[PDB]
A paper describes a structure:
Here, we report the structure and function of the [name] photosystem I ([name]) supercomplex in low light conditions, where it expands its photon-absorbing capacity by assembling with the light-harvesting complexes I ([name]) and a prasinophyte-specific light-harvesting complex (Lhcp). Interestingly, nine Lhcp subunits, including one Lhcp1 monomer with a phosphorylated amino-terminal threonine and eight Lhcp2 monomers, oligomerize into three trimers and associate with [name] on the third side between [name] and PsaK. While Lhcp, Lhcb (apoproteins of LHCII), and Lhca (apoproteins of [name]) all belong to the LHC superfamily, Lhcp proteins form a separate clade with characteristics of an ancestral state of LHC proteins instead of belonging to the clades of Lhcb or Lhca. In terms of pigment composition, OtLhcp1 and OtLhcp2 each contain 14 Chl molecules (8 Chl a, 5 Chl b, and 1 Mdp) and 7 carotenoid molecules (4 Dlt, 2 Prx, and 1 Nex).
Through the single-particle cryo-EM method, the structure of OtPSI-[name]-Lhcp supercomplex is solved at an overall resolution of 2.94 Å and the local regions of three Lhcp trimers (namely Trimers 1–3) are refined to 2.9–3.5 Å. The OtPSI-[name]-Lhcp supercomplex consists of a central [name] monomer encircled by six LHCIs and three Trimers. OtPSI contains two large core subunits ([name] and [name]), three subunits on the stromal surface ([name], PsaD, and PsaE), nine small membrane-embedded subunits (PsaF, [name], PsaH, PsaI, PsaJ, PsaK, PsaL, PsaM, [name]), one subunit on the lumenal surface (PsaN). In the supercomplex, a total of 314 Chls (245 Chl a, 60 Chl b, 9 magnesium 2,4-divinylpheoporphyrin a5 monomethyl ester [Mdp], 104 carotenoids, 2 phylloquinones, and 3 Fe4S4 clusters have been located). To our best knowledge, the structure of OtPSI has the largest number of subunits among the structures of [name] known so far (including those from plants, green algae, diatom, red algae, and cyanobacteria). Four Lhca ([name]-4) complexes are associated with the [name] core at the side of [name]- F-J-K, similar to those found in plant [name]-[name] complexes. On the other side formed by [name]-I-M-H, an Lhca5-[name] heterodimer is associated with the [name] core. Besides the six Lhca proteins, three Lhcp Trimers (Trimers 1–3) bind to the [name]-[name] complex on the third side along the surfaces of [name], PsaH, PsaL, [name], and PsaK subunits. Notably, this supercomplex did not exhibit far-red peaks in the 77 K fluorescence spectra, which is possibly due to the weak coupling of the chlorophyll a603-a609 pair in OtLhca1-4. In conclusion, the cryo-EM structure of the [name] supercomplex in [name] has revealed a unique hybrid of both plant-type and green algal-type [name] supercomplexes with three Lhcp trimers located at the ‘state 2’ position.
Numbering used by the authors:
A (entry chain A): 10 to 751
B (entry chain L): 47 to 204
C (entry chain H): 71 to 166
D (entry chain C): 2 to 81
E (entry chain O): 40 to 135
F (entry chain D): 46 to 188
G (entry chain K): 45 to 131
Write the structure that this text describes.
Amino acid sequence: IKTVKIVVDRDPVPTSFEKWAKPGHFSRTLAKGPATTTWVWDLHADAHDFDSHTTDLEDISRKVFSAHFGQLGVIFIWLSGMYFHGARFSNYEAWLSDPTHIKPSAQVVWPIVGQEILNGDVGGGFQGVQITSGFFQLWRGSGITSELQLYSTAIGALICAGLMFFAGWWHYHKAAPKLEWFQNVESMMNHHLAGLLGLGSLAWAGHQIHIALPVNTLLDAGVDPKEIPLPHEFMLNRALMAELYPSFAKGLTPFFTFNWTEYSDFLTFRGGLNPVTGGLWLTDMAHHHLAIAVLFLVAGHQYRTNWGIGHSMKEILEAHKGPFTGEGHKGLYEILTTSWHAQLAINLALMGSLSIIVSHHMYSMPPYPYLATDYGTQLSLFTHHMWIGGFCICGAAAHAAIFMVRDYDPATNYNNVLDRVLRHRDAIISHLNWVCIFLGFHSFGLYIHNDTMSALGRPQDMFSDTAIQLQPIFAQFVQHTHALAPELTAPTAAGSTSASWGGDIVAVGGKIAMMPISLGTSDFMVHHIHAFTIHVTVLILLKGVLFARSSRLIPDKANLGFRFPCDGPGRGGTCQVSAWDHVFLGLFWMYNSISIVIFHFSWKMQSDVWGSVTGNGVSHITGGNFAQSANTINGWLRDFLWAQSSQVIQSYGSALSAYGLIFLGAHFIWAFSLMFLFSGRGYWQELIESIVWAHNKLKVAPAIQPRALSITQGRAVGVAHYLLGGIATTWSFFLARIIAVG
Amino acid sequence: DKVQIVKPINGDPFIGMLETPVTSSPDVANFLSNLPAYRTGVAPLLRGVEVGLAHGFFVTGPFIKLGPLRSTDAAELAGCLSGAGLVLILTACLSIYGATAFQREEVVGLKTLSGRTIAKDPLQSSEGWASFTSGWLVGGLSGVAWSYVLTQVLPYYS
Amino acid sequence: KYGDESVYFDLSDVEATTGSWDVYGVDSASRYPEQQAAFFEAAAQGLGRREAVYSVLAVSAGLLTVAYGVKGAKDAKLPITVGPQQPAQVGPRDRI
Amino acid sequence: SHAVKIYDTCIGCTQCVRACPTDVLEMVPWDGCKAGQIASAPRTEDCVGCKRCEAACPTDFLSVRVYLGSETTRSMGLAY
Amino acid sequence: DLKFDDDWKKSNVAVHLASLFGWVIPSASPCPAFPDNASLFKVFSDRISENLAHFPTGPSADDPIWLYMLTWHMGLFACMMFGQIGVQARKQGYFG
Amino acid sequence: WTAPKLDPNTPSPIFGGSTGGLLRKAQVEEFYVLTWEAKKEAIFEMPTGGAAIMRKGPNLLKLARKEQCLALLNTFRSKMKLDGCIYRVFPSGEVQYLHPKDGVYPEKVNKGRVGANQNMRSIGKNTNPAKIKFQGKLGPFEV
Amino acid sequence: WSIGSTENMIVCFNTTAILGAMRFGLMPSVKKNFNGASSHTAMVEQANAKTIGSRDPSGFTAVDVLAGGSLATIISAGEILAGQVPY
Ligand code: CLA
Ligand code: CLA
Ligand code: CLA
Ligand code: CLA
Ligand code: CLA
Ligand SMILES: CC1=C(/C=C/C(C)=C/C=C/C(C)=C/C=C/C=C(C)/C=C/C=C(C)/C=C/C2=C(C)CCCC2(C)C)C(C)(C)CCC1
Ligand SMILES: CC1=C(C/C=C(\C)CCC[C@H](C)CCC[C@H](C)CCCC(C)C)C(=O)c2ccccc2C1=O
Ligand code: SF4
Ligand code: SF4
């Protein structure tokens, strides 16, 4: 039972540019110098492969910690930039007065080559590139009413970025912690729950209560942002705050006497949306963050660090074992306290799932004022966080495989929960593959059969709502229970969590903030498609992880490495056997799945939720054609791809001409990726030989010998350009469409 | 005292199988062992009979209730003729499998999990598979006809 | 011996060494009623031969296709057998 | 099975033999090289064709070459 | 040994009865959230009676029987699974 | 090395079982046996998947492929510095001494080995395939 | 709220009961809890936290006091806020 304490080596590495002058210092093969042009790609590929640089885990941990400091400095630079642009290059103050009709914009282009046309008529006597990041909605929900506040926090963010870089330099060059510092996971959880999430949520609840809540209440009442009292005048002047919310006239006495019901005016459980702004009630969000803060503060006292109270996570792992799982979770504490890649796999998986949940929960329960009404930012946020989630999950698989090849020790995992998974990986993969086939056959024939029947002129034999009812009865049941939650199972809630469950469509300024979402047969089919695509991505990734060390084809695959191209053309051909290549295909399917998720989201919202109420029912964007057309591949091709592409392809001569140019360019990059994907190194190397002959003819032969990309690098470039082109095509399409239609 | 359930196949941990509550449970084992395919001492023809009857009986139903003529009054007759046609196709598949599959000696024997040496299944031979195919054909056509009869006869059918 | 402790190789017990185990098979000689067995033996008397089944399926294929093209298709009221029974339409450039 | 051929440029560095995952290659005495040994491929039937020997051969051009031919069970590397 | 144990279930009648009835009784206790302080088992049985009058006609998609069925069966099965786990673990050396 | 070592019934390594073991190919066609002498009890990695404990003294292990046996033996030699031999076992019940096939590991030159599949020429001195046209030749390499 | 009120008496009773429980080994404490114990019915002395600094003859610590007070305040909050929910 080691005592948790602070441990450091003083001045472990001097601060010097001698390593900057020498590329590839971190390695041994790259340190000697470039013999061939492969060396550049090798340098960049293993730039952040700290495990392959040094054997000792202490130096790796220090490198990771200071690299995290550098990333956080980069993120703070990005935030400083966004706030600074929102201050000197935006119409945030104009948008504040008319958020329903002024398009948010925080980027203005220089008028050089005729690109000034990209400065669109976004309103407010302003021109610029309309933004979809939702930053304006975030600032309004945070209570920012002036550009000076944006400038002030931007400068703060820049200072914090400098501090983050200084902290990384300090914790690598001056005060690098020892390995026993990083391995204090109990303390880590205690702090990252109570102090990062707990105290962070408490701080944000306090901000929301004292700054965002009064300012946004005045904005809701119709008060001009330039007439609202400043935030310090609300936080400090208790009479001013109590004028808006009379519970503040009682001070902290109800808080400290457990008379918390007196705070019910500014700490509510209303549920639903603000009818004026179309966002979540800010009293609800303040109460939310308060309870989250309390829950995390309590949960951060779970683990024992230096005083006997608390848990030891090793013990609670090892005590969980059973008749089917052998020794159970024994040895996993060693895995996750002596392998960075294992932790990275778990954390990336959970981060990716979380980003996905974030997208779902933000479209369905818009947390910001005038966010739902701005359809472009809502679609953009959903699609963005979906893509981030899918990428993070693919990385989680990759780092799981990396751990499995490199840091997995059979001695410390004899009969534990991991070794038994490795002992029936054949059953897992075969059942998953069977599931994957089943799912694909059924779901695709649900679309292909419909295509065939429609083409044969047999709509009564289709799987549409009219012909054959494949109703998602279970999802409709969940919708019903959630719409009736505020009456029986959530009695203190004044309303449902989202209006998507049912009843009382929410409209702000004509356009619909939120509308109950129905689920017909097209929703059934597309959701089973989603499950199919997820299950195939999981098949690929889990097969890569489980067969990372060995297989019946290659038993000695662990020593071949995590990232090797093949084992040769023998055994019939051993291409793409490495778990890295599984992440390649895994990445591909991930992309494919997300492409369907975001297409379903965009079409369903344009057809059945988004629109404008005019007193004579809803006028949706596409007119509700999803329910009757999204049961056929032809329907998606025609009524979603072909129909909604008119905005992006006819965007030339307007501010969306940039989106049209990116649409074409991303198409090109995707097709360009097909070059790297469909070809192989041998051809390109021979072409290089001919070109090198041509150069040697004129004595232009480089000292660094030209080489074709490695096979792994060729696959890497292919998947990277494919993902770039596909996603940027969808990005340009979605943004141009949703900005033009509004 | 710390009982482990999942065990290797027949106690040999070097064969590609594991005995689990799905594979070696007494109820599962008794159900599967009592199915006609696993009655190796019985004549292949009669095992094929029951097989065909069960299979041809159920396989008709999808064609009845989801076929092109499901709405028409002739839905049942169409579905049963579809089922009979599928039985004929499966008879062709069985005949070709029986002609091609059993061409090797298979010198290695077979034993039970208790270690009792037992003779090979007569079904697992060319002539035995031919007899099984004939039993399949008779059983499948009888089962399809029975499904037709029951759709025309059964009181609560709709 | 195969039954020894930690021994799973035996050149005398090749079946246990190689894993060729009858998992669920049962060698009971009779399960069905004998007369039911006799009926279904007689029902498949000539079909026990593979080439007899080949002749059966060839004849069945011919009879089913002939009957379908002569009588079966019309009886099922296929739309293809029913005539168009509608006025025709002219393509662009007045091309019928 | 495949065909594996050893050529007289072999220096007897043994790397082909050490790289073979199926024990196809072996070192035999030979007066042609300084090291006093040449590789050979007696167990050619076991050659899966993975070409690890060619990857591990330092001599330019390769002294060991694998020519993929008739595919058998062992050459296909099947556990079934 | 390494042979599969045919008594893997360890099905104990006392476990079955304890889990079933020690979920039924708490689920038959008064619950002030439900109307008339009715229990989850009470409202579930009421919905069963109302839907069993129309035996062929299934319950409507909006009828409360589904939520009661889920929220009762979860607790039941939780009691069954945890009761088996706890009994077989106490019998073994997992606890003492 | 007067005679190849015979194959006794030696204890197998402790293993909980796996789905990666012998398939029907062991029954119909062949399977391979790896036997090695262990200096001490230790945990090694199965080439099929999972972790097993080898017993002190001789051990016997049956695997589907020669490649699996040789990979595991190479692990034992390079990490644990053990000695092992491989047999091929047919369904008829005749084993077959395989590794090293001489009593000497192939990487070490041993007297008595005869060169097989050796072309006493460089790779470029092979004739063109057009010269061996319409001949029962595998290729330029076999002439 | 006042001295002798129901909420004050609830919280005072909760903190007294909790501190007494973990002072006399009835509740897990700094110097005796389930870390490295055997079964549910027996706690064990924690050598890592043994003699961590106290002047109380049973070895009651300040962290014991803080933990018992936090848990008591948590429980008192739960009990008092029952009956304050709107419904
Ligand atoms: C109350 C205590 C506390 C808090 C708030 C944090 C917060 C954080 N830690 Mg953790 N950490 C703690 C205690 C704490 N730690 C303890 C006790 C240990 C030792 C066991 C560690 C060991 C640890 C490791 C090994 C790593 C982190 C990382 C991180 C950062 C993750 C990025 C993120 O979520 O951005 C949230 C971003 C913000 C909250 C913005 C402000 C950023 C600053 C840095 C917050 C200040 C926190 C600091 C503890 C207080 C200043 C102390 C300083 C003056 C000495 C996050 C800033 C990772 C990281 O990114 O490294 C930099 C990482 O690799 N921590
Ligand atoms: C982290 C989040 C956060 C923060 C910072 C605050 C902060 C504040 N709240 Mg809010 N509040 C929060 C969350 C938060 N709240 C939540 C979650 C709720 C819901 C229950 C409330 C509900 C609430 C109500 C209902 C009220 C407040 C009030 C207040 C103010 C009273 C502070 C005070 O005097 O108490 C005591 C604070 C101290 C004793 C600390 C001061 C110590 C100083 C800094 C020490 C410095 C000494 C230094 C060493 C040397 C001096 C010299 C040096 C400077 C040179 C303060 C601005 C009151 C108010 O006036 O609001 C308008 C009020 O009525 N809060
Ligand atoms: C928390 C996140 C995280 C962290 C810390 C790491 C860290 C690491 N990863 Mg993991 N990974 C992640 C996320 C993460 N990755 C995700 C999300 C994926 C899925 C894509 C992967 C997939 C992955 C694979 C497949 C591999 C790694 C590898 C590595 C290691 C070396 C990386 C390196 O030096 O390359 C430096 C970085 C690069 C060479 C990337 C260059 C930029 C690419 C092309 C994308 C740029 C796209 C851009 C946004 C579009 C615009 C471009 C514009 C200029 C035109 C290092 C341990 C490698 C390894 O050996 O592991 C041990 C390895 O093989 N990772
Ligand atoms: C549209 C193109 C396409 C199609 C149809 C498939 C189809 C398939 N892929 Mg491939 N794949 C593709 C593109 C495609 N992939 C591309 C471009 C990539 C990137 C490299 C991948 C990468 C890839 C990997 C890495 C994996 C797959 C897997 C799969 C299977 C998933 C199971 C499934 O779909 O159910 C079954 C098949 C279908 C539904 C396919 C369509 C068939 C329709 C419904 C017709 C049905 C029968 C029809 C009536 C014909 C009978 C009559 C005929 C004889 C005349 C399936 C074979 C996974 C796999 O094999 O495991 C299951 C897998 O691991 N694929
Ligand atoms: C898998 C996806 C899928 C599904 C669900 C359907 C479904 C259907 N099609 Mg479509 N179709 C599809 C793909 C699919 N099709 C594709 C890809 C094509 C090619 C273009 C077509 C072309 C097509 C045509 C041309 C026609 C249909 C028709 C039909 C219907 C009747 C088919 C029939 O007779 O089945 C017979 C079914 C079976 C013999 C068996 C089905 C499987 C059973 C139920 C599985 C049960 C397993 C069980 C759960 C396991 C239990 C184990 C336990 C004992 C232990 C039905 C609605 C016909 C129609 O008009 O009807 C509307 C028709 O004319 N289909
Ligand atoms: C007998 C004796 C004595 C006396 C004693 C006593 C009487 C003690 C006490 C103690 C106490 C009396 C303590 C207390 C503590 C407390 C605490 C530590 C608290 C805490 C709290 C918390 C942590 C909270 C949290 C929260 C909040 C803030 C809000 C929300 C909710 C909750 C609740 C969660 C003397 C010394 C004279 C001498 C010796 C003997
Ligand atoms: C195109 C292609 C190549 C050929 C690509 C070559 C080798 C490299 C790509 C070109 C870069 C741009 C060369 C770097 C140029 C220098 C950095 C010079 C400075 C640039 C000035 C021109 C400005 C492969 O090597 C390959 C390998 C495996 C699978 C697919 C492929 C593949 O598709
Ligand atoms: S073949 Fe290449 S590797 Fe094998 S010995 Fe001769 S030279 Fe060394
Ligand atoms: S190909 Fe693979 S197996 Fe055949 S020799 Fe070269 S290395 Fe040994």
